[PDB]
Each structure stands twice: as structure tokens, then as C-alpha cells.
Amino acid sequence: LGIPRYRPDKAETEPQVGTAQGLAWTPVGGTLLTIEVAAVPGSGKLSLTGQLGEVMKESAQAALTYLRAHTQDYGLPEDFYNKVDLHVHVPDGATPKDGPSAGITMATAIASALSRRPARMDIAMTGEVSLRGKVMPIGGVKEK
């Protein structure tokens, strides 16, 4: 047959500088939704794109409040909220299935990008979050 377009049994996936590898529980098929973030220097905006619904935003700021409670606990500065911009695109977000299931995937993405440290290859993970940080339960753990 033709050439390997995909990676092997995943032991080569390059550690992602800021890109998490999130779960997909989708009409289109289960996959990875690798959310990438432009670690860009600005004056503190944080915008989200990628045909995405609002529960994905609210999971992202739930991870963000958890991040800003842990600025000294990771590579974040003392006050990052007013100094750095984070364009947060998601590859496939026009999904009424997909609720806020990747806020921890958001969290790994944002802390890996702001920390400039590798978000891991090959931990495909999911779960709805609280604001204060408690990983809320989810149903549909089957498809995830």
C-alpha cells in the first residue's frame, strides 16, 4: 500500500511545546482534538476561536482561574493576566455534543504554553471542571 501518513504506535509523537492532545467524543468520530495556543506577548487579552461554543470558553477560564491560583506553582509570572495574550484556537468545535470536556486539556495547553514546557504526547483525557478547580464528573465516559 502507500506510505505511512500517520505516526506509528504512538511512541514518537513530539512532546508539544504548548499543544495538548484532548479527547473527542464527537458525531464525526472519536479522535484527538489537539488544541494549540499562540503564546503571544500583548496587553492581556485571551480570545478563543475555532467554531467553538461557550462551554468550551467557560472550561478554559475555569482552568484559567485554577492557573492564576497557581502562578508560583508553575512557570507563570506573579501577574500574567494583564501582560500576555493567548489566542486559543480549537481544531473542531462546532459540536453540540462537545460540552466543556477539555478544560483540563485547556489547562495542560495553557500551562504548557505559558510555562513554555512540553505538554505531553499521548495522554488522551477528558472531563468537565469546576471554577475553583475540582474536576467535575462527566457522563458518556464510554466514548471518551
For the annotated catalytic residues, the residue numbers are 101, 144
The answer to whether residues 40 and 86 touch, using CB atoms and an 8 Å cutoff, is: yes
| Segment (H or E) for 127 | none
Contact region for its own copies (CB under 8 A) — 15-23, 29-37, 59-67, 119-127?
59-67
Quick check: 85 binds its own copies (CB under 8 A)? yes
Which residue from 80, 89, 93, 115 is in contact with its own copies, where contact means CB under 8 A? 89
Contact region for its own copies (CB under 8 A) — 13-21, 31-39, 42-50, 60-68?
60-68
Question: Contacts with its own copies in 101-120 (CB under 8 A)?
Answer: 113
Question: Contacts with its own copies in 122-141 (CB under 8 A)?
Answer: 131-132
Residue number with CB closer to its own copies (21 or 57): 57
Quick check: 61 binds its own copies (CB under 8 A)? yes
Q: How far apart are alpha carbons 69 and 67 in whole angstroms?
A: 5
Phi, psi angles (nearest 5°) of residue 7: -70, 165
| Segment (H or E) for 84 | strand 84-89
Number of residues binding to its own copies, judged by CB under 8 A:
13
> CA-based angle 32:35:39, to the nearest 5?
155
The answer to whether residues 87 and 53 touch, using CB atoms and an 8 Å cutoff, is: no
Q: Is 26 annotated as a binding residue?
A: no
Tally of CA atoms within 13 A in the half-sphere of 9 that contains its CB: 0
Residue number with CB closer to its own copies (89 or 144): 89
C-alpha cell at 70: 497557581
Which residue from 38, 49, 51, 81 is in contact with its own copies, where contact means CB under 8 A? 81
Give the length of the chain: 144
Quick check: 88 binds its own copies (CB under 8 A)? yes
